[PDB]
PDB file of C-alpha atoms and ligand atoms in Angstrom:
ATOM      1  CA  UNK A 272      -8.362 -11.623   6.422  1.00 28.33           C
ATOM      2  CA  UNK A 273      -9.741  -8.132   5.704  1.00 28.81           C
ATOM      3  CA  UNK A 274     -11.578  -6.119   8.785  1.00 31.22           C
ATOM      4  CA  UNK A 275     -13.118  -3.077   8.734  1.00 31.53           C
ATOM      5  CA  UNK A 276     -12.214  -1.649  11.798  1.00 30.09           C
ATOM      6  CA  UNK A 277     -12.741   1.764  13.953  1.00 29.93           C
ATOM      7  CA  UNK A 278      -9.653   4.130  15.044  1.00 29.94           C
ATOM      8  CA  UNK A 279     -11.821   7.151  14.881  1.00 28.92           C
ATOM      9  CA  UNK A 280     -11.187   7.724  18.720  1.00 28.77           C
ATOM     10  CA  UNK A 281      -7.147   8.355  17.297  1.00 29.58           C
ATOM     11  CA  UNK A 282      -8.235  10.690  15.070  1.00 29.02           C
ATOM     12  CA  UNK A 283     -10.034  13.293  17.289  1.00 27.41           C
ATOM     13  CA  UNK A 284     -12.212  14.280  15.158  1.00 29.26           C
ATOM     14  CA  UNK A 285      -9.820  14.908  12.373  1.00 26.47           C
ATOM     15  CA  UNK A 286     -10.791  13.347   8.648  1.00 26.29           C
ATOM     16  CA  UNK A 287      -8.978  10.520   7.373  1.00 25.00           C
ATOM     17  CA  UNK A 288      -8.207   6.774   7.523  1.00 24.80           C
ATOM     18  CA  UNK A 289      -5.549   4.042   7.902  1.00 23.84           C
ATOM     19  CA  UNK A 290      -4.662   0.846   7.072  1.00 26.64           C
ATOM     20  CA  UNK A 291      -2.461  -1.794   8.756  1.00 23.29           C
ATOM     21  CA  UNK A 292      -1.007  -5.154   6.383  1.00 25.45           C
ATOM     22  CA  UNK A 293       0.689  -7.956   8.018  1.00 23.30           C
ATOM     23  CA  UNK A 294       1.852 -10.070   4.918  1.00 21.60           C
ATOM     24  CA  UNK A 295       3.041 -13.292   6.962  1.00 21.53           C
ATOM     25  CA  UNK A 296      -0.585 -13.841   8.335  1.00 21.59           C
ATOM     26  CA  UNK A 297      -2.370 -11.579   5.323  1.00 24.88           C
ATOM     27  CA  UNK A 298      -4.231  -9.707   8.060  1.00 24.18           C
ATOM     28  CA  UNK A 299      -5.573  -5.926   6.646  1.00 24.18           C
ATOM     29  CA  UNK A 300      -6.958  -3.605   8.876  1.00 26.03           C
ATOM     30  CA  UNK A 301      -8.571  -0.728   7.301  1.00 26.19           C
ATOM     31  CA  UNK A 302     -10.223   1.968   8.542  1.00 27.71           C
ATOM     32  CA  UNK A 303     -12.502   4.062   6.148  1.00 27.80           C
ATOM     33  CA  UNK A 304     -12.239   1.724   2.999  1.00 26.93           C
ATOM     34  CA  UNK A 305     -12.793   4.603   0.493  1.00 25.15           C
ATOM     35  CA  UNK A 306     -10.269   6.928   1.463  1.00 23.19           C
ATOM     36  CA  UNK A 307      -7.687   3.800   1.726  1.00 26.71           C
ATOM     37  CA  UNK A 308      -8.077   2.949  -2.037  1.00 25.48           C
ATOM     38  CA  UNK A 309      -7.992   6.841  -3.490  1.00 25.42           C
ATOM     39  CA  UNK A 310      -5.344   7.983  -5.429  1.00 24.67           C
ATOM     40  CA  UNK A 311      -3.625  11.352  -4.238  1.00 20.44           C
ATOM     41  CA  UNK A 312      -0.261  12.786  -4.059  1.00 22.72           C
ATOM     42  CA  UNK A 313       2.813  10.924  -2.028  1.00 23.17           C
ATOM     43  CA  UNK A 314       4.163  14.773  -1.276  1.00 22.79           C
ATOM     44  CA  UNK A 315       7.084  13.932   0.939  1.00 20.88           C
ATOM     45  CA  UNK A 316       6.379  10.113   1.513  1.00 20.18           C
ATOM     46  CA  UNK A 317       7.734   9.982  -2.208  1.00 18.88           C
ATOM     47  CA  UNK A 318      11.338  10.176  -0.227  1.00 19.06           C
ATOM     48  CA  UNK A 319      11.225   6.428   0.473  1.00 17.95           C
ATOM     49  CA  UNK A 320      11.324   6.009  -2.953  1.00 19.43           C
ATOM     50  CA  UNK A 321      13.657   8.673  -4.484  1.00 17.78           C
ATOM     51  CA  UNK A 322      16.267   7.882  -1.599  1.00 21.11           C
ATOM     52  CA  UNK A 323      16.207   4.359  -3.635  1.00 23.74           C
ATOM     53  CA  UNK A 324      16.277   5.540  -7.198  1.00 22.13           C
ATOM     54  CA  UNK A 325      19.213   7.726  -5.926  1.00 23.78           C
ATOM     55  CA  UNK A 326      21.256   4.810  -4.270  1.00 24.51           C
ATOM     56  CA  UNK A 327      20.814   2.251  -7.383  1.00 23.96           C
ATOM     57  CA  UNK A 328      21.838   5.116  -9.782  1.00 24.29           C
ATOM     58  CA  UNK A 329      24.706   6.172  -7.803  1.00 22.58           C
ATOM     59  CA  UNK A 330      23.849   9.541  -7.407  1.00 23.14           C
ATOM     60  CA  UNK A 331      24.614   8.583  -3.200  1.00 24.32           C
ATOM     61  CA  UNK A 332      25.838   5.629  -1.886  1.00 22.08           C
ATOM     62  CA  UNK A 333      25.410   5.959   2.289  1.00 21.81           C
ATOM     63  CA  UNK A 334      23.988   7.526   4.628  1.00 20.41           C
ATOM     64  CA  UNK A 335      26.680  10.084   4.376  1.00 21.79           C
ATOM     65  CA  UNK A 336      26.249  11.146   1.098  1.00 23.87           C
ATOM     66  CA  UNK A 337      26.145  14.951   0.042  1.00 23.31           C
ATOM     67  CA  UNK A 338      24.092  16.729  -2.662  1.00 22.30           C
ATOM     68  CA  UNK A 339      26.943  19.538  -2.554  1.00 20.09           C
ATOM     69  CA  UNK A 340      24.929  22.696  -1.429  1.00 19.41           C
ATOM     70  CA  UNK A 341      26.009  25.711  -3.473  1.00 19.43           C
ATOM     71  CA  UNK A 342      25.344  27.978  -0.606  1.00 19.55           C
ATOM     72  CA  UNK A 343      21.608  29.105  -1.349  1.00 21.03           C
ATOM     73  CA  UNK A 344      19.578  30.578   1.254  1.00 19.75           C
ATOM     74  CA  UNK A 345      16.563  28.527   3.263  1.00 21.93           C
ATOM     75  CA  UNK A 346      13.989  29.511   5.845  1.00 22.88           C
ATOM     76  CA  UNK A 347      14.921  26.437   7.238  1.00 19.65           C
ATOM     77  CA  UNK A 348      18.057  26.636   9.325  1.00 20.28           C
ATOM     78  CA  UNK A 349      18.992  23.044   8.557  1.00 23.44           C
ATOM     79  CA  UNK A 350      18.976  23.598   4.632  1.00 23.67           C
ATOM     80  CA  UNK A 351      22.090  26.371   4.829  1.00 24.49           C
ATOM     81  CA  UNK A 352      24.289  23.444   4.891  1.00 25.30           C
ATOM     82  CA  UNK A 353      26.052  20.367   2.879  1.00 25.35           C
ATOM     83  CA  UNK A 354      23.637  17.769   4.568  1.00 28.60           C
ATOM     84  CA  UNK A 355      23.853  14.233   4.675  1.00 29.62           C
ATOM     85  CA  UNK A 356      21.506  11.989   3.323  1.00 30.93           C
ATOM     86  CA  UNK A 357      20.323  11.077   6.680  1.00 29.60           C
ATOM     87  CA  UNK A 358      20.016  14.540   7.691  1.00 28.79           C
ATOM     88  CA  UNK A 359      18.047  15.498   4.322  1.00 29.52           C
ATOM     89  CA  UNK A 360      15.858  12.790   5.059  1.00 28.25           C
ATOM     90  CA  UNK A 361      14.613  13.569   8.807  1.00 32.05           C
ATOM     91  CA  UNK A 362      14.775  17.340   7.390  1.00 29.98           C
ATOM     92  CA  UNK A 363      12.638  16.676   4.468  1.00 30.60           C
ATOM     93  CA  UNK A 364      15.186  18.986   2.321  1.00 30.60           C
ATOM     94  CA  UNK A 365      13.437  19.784  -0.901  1.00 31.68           C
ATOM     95  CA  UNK A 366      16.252  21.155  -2.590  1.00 30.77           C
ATOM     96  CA  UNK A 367      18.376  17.800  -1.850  1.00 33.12           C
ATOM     97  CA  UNK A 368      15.933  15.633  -3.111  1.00 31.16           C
ATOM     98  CA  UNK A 369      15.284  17.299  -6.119  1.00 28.49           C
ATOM     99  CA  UNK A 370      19.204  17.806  -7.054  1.00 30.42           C
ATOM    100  CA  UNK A 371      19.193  14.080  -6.585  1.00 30.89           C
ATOM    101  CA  UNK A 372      16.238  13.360  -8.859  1.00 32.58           C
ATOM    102  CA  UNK A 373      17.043  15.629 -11.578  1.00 32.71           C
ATOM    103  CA  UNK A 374      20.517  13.660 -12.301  1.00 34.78           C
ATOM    104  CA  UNK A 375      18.256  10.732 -12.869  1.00 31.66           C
ATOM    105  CA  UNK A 376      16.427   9.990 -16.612  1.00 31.38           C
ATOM    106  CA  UNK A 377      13.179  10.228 -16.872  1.00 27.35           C
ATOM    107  CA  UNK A 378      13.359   6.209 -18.059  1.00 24.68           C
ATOM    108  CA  UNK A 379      14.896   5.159 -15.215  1.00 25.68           C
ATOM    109  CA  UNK A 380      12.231   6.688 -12.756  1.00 26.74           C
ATOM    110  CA  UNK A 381       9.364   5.636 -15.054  1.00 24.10           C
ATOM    111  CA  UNK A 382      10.477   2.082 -15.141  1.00 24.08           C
ATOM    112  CA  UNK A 383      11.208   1.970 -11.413  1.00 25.71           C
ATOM    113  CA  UNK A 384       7.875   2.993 -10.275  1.00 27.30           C
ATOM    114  CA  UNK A 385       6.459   0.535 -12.769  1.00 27.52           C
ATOM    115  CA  UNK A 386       8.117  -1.810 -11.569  1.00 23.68           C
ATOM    116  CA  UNK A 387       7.474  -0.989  -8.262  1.00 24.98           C
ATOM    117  CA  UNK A 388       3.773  -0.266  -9.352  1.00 25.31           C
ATOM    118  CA  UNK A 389       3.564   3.265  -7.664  1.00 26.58           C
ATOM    119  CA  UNK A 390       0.518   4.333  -8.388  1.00 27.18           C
ATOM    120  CA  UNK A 391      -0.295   6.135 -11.743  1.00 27.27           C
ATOM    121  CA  UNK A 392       3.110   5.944 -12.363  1.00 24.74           C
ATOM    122  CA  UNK A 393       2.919   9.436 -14.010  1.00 25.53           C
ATOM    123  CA  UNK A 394       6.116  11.727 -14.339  1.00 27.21           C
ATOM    124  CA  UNK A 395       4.365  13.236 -17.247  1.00 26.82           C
ATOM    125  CA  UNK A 396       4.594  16.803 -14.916  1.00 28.28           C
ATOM    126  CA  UNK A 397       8.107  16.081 -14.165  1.00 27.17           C
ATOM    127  CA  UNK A 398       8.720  19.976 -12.979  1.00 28.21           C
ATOM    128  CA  UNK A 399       5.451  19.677 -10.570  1.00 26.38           C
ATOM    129  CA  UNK A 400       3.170  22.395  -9.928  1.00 28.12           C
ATOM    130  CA  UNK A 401       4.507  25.667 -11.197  1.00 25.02           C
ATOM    131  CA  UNK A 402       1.254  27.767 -10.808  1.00 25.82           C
ATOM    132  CA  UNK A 403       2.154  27.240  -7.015  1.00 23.72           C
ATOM    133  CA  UNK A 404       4.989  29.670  -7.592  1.00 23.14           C
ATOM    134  CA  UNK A 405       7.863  27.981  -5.877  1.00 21.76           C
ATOM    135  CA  UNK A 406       9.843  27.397  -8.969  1.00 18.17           C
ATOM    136  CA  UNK A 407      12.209  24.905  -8.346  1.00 18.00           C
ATOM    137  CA  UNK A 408      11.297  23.700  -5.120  1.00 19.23           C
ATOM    138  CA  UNK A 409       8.339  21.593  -7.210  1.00 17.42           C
ATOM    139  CA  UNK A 410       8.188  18.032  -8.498  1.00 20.12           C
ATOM    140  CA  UNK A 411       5.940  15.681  -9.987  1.00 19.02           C
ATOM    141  CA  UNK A 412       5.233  13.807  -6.564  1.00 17.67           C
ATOM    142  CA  UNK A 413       4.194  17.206  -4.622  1.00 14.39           C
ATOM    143  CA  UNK A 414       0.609  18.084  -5.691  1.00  9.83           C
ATOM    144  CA  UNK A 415       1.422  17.174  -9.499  1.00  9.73           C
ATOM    145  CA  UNK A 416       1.312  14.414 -11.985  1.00  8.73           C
ATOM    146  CA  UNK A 417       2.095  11.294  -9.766  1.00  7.98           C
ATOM    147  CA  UNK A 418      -0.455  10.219  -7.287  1.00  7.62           C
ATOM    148  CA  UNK A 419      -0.701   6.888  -5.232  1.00  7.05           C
ATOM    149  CA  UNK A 420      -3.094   5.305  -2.870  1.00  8.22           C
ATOM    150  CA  UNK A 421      -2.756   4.553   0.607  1.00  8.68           C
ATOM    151  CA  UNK A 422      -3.426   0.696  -0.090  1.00  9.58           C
ATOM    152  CA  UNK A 423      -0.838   1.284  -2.959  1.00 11.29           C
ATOM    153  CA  UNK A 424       1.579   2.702  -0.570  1.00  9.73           C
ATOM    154  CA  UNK A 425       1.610   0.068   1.727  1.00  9.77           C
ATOM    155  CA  UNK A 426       1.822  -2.701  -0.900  1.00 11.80           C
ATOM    156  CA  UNK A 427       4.659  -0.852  -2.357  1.00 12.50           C
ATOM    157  CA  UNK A 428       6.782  -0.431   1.464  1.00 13.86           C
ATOM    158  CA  UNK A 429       5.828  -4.528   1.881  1.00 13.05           C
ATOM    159  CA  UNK A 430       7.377  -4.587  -1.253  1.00 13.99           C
ATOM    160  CA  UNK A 431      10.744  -3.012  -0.661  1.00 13.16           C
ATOM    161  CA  UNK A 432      11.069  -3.980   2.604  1.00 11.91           C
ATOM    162  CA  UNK A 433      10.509  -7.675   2.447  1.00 15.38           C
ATOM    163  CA  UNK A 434      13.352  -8.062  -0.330  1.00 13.66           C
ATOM    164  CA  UNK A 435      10.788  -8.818  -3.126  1.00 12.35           C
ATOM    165  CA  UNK A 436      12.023  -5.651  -5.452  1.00 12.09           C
ATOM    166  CA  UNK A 437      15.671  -5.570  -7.232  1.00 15.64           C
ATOM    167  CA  UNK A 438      16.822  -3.116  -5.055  1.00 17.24           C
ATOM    168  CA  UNK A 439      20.099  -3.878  -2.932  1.00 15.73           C
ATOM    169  CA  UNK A 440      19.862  -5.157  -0.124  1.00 19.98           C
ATOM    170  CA  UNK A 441      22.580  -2.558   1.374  1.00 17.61           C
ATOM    171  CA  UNK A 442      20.711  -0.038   0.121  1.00 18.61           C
ATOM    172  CA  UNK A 443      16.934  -0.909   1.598  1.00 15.19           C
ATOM    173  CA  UNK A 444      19.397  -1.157   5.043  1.00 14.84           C
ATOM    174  CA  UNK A 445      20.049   2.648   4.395  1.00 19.89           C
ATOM    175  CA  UNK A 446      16.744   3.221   4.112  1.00 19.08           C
ATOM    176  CA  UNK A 447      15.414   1.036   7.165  1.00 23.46           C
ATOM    177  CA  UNK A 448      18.193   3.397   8.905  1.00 26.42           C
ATOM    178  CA  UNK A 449      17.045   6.420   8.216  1.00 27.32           C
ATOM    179  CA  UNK A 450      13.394   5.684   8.753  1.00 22.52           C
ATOM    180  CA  UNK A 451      13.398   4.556  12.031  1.00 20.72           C
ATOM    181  CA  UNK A 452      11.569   6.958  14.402  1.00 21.07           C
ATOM    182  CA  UNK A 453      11.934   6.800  18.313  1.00 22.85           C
ATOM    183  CA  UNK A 454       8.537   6.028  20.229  1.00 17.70           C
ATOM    184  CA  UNK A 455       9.234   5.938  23.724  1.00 20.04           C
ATOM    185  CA  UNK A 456       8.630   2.346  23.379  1.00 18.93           C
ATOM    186  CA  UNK A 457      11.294  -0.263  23.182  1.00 21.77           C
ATOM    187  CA  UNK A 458       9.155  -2.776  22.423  1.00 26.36           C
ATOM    188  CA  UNK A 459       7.858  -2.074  18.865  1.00 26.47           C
ATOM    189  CA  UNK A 460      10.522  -0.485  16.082  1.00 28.20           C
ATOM    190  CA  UNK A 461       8.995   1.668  13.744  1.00 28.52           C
ATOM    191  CA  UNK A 462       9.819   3.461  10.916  1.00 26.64           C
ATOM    192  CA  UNK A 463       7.821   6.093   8.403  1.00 24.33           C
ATOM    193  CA  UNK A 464       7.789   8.910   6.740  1.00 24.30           C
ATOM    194  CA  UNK A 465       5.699  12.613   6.650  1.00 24.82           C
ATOM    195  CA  UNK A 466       3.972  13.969   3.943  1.00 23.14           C
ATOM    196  CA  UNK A 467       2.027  17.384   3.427  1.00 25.95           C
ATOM    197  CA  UNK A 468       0.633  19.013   0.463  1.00 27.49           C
ATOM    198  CA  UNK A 469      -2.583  20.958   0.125  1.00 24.08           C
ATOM    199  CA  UNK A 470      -4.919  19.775  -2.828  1.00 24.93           C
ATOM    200  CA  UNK A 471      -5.990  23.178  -4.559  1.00 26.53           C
ATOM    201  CA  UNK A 472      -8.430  21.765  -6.653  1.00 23.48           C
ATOM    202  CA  UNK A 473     -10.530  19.900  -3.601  1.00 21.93           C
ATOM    203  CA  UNK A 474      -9.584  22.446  -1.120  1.00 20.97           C
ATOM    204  CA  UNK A 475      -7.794  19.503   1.565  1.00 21.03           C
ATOM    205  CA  UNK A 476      -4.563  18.669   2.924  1.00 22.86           C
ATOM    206  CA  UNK A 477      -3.116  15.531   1.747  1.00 23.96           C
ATOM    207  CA  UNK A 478      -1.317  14.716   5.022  1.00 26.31           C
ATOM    208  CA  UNK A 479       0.547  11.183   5.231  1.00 23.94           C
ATOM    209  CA  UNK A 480       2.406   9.102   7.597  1.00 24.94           C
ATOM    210  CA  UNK A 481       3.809   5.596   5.752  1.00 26.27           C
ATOM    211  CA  UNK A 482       6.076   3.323   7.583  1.00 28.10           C
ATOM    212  CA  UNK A 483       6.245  -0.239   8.839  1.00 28.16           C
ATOM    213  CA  UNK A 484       6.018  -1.793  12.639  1.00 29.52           C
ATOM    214  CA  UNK A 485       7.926  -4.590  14.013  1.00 30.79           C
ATOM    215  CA  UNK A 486       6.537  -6.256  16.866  1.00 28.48           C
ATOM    216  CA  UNK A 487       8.161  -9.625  17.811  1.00 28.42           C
ATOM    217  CA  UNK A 488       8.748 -11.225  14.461  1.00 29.38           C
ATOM    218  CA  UNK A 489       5.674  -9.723  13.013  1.00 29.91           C
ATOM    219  CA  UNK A 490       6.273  -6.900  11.219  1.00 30.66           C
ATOM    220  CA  UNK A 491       2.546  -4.313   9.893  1.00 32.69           C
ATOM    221  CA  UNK A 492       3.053  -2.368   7.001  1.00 31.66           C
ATOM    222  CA  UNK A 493       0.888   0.925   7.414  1.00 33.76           C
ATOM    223  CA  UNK A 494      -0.522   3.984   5.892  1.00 33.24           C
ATOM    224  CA  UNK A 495      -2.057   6.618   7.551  1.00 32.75           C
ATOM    225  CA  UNK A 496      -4.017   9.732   5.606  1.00 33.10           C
ATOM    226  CA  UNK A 497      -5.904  12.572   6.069  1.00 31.01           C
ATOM    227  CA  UNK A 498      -7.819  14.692   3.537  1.00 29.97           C
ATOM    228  CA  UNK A 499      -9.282  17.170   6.454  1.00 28.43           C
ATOM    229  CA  UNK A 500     -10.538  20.674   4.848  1.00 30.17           C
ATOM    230  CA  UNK A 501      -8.368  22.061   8.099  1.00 30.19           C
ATOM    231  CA  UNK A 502      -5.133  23.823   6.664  1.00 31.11           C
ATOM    232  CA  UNK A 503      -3.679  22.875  10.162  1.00 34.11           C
ATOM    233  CA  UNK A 504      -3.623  18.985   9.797  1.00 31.00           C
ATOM    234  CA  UNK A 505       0.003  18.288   8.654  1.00 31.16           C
ATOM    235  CA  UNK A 506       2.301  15.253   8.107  1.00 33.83           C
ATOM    236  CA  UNK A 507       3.356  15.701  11.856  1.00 34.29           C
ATOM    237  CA  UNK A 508       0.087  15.856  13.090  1.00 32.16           C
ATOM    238  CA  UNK A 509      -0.961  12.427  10.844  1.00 32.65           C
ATOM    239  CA  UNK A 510       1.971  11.176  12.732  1.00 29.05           C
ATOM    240  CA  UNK A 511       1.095  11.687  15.839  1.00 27.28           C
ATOM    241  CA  UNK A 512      -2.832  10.173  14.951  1.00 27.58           C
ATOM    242  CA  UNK A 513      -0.718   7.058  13.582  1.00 28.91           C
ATOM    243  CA  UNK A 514       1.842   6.640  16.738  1.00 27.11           C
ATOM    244  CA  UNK A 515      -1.531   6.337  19.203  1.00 27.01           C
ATOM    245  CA  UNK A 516      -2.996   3.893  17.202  1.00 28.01           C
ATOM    246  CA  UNK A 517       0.306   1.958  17.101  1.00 28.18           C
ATOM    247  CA  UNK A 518       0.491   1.587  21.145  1.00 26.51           C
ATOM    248  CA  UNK A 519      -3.647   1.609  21.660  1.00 26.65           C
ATOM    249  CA  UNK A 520      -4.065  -1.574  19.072  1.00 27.94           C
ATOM    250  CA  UNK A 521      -0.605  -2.688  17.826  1.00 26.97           C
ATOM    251  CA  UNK A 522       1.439  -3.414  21.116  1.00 30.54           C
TER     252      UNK A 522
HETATM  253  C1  LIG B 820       6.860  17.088   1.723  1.00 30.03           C
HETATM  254  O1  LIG B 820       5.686  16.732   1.816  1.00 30.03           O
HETATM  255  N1  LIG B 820       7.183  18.310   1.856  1.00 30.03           N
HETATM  256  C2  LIG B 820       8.562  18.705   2.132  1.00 30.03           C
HETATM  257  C3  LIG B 820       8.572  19.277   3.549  1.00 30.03           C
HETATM  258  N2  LIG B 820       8.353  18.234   4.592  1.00 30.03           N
HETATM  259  O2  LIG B 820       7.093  17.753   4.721  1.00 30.03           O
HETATM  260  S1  LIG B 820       6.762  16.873   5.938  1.00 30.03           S
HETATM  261  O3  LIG B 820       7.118  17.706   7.303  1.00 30.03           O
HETATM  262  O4  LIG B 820       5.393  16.455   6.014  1.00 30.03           O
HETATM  263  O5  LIG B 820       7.581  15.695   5.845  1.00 30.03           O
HETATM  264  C4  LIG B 820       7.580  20.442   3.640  1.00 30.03           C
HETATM  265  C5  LIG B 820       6.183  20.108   3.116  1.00 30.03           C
HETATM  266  C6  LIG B 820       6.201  19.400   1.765  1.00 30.03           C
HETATM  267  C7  LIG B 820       6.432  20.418   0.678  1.00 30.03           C
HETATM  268  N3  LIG B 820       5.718  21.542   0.700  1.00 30.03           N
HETATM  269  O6  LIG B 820       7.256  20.217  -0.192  1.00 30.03           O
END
């Protein structure tokens, strides 16, 4: 039961698209079909995933677990420290992430995102996008090698988060955990992720929010995108497009 539907009035006038999966029912919404199948970066969205890779390979184990932080100073006020996994999560803590990635093999990952078919599956730019000039604080999911579609995305959180992947079941717990966003709405859970990167070549943002809804035992799996030319539209901002078309058509 695919429909093409119309959340432009979310959007205010901001480029971009969404789609909304219930899997029980097999009811997609989509909104701007074309955008919804293109490949582009996961920037931070790629978190859902490496937070997995990371708790299967033992490199963490709960929601406490530290990176140990070697002292190194960050803009960020919240990166001075020896943050939890939670914390590095809701912080978006690049250095954190990419410790934890960089004790993995590149096997392992390639084999879990085949598995998990994540796209193009391509690590081949394992270091990311050095011409950027931030060094270390690069990767291949931010504005490099590995780039996945918003349908993708969504197929890949349905996935994970009905139990049809090898992934413990504790684990996929910790994620659901740390995911979970507060709405001002008791009624609906959800849970997502931000993403922002800046696409050089095309001159747009890629700006995500990917998550899941639960709404009385039905539960939407959802991907929202933009690829505005506007420098300004972030992750937040995608966020905030995707949180008013959760209460306007999914309450
Ligand atoms: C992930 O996309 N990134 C890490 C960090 N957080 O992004 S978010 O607020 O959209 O979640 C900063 C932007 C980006 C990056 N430049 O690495």
């Amino acid at each position: 039961s695919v429909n093409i539907v119309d959340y432009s009035d979310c959007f205010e006038g901001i480029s971009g698209g969404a789609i909304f999966c219930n899997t029980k029912n097999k009811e997609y919404n989509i909104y701007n079909k074309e955008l919804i199948e293109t490949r582009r970066s996961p920037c931070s969205t790629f978190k859902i995933v490496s937070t997995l890779i990371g708790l299967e390979k033992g490199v963490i184990n709960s929601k406490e677990s530290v990176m140990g932080y070697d002292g190194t100073d960050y803009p960020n006020k919240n990166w001075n420290k020896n943050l939890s996994l939670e914390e590095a999560f809701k912080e978006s803590c690049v250095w954190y992430y990419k410790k934890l990635i960089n004790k993995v093999d590149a096997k392992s990952v390639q084999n879990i995102l085949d598995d998990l078919k994540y796209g193009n599956c391509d690590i081949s730019e394992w270091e990311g996008d050095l011409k950027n000039g931030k060094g270390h604080l690069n990767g291949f999911w931010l504005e490099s090698s590995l780039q996945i579609s918003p349908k993708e995305q969504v197929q890949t959180m349905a996935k994970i988060f009905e139990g049809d992947t090898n992934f413990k079941k504790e684990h996929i717990n910790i994620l659901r955990d740390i995911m979970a966003i507060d709405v001002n709405d008791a009624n609906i859970n959800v849970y997502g992720k931000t993403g922002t990167g800046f696409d050089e070549k095309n001159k747009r943002v890629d700006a995500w929010f990917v998550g899941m809804l639960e709404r009385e035992g039905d539960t939407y799996y959802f991907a929202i995108k933009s690829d505005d030319s506007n420098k300004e539209i972030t992750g937040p901002k995608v966020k905030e497009i995707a949180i008013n078309i959760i209460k306007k058509y999914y309450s």
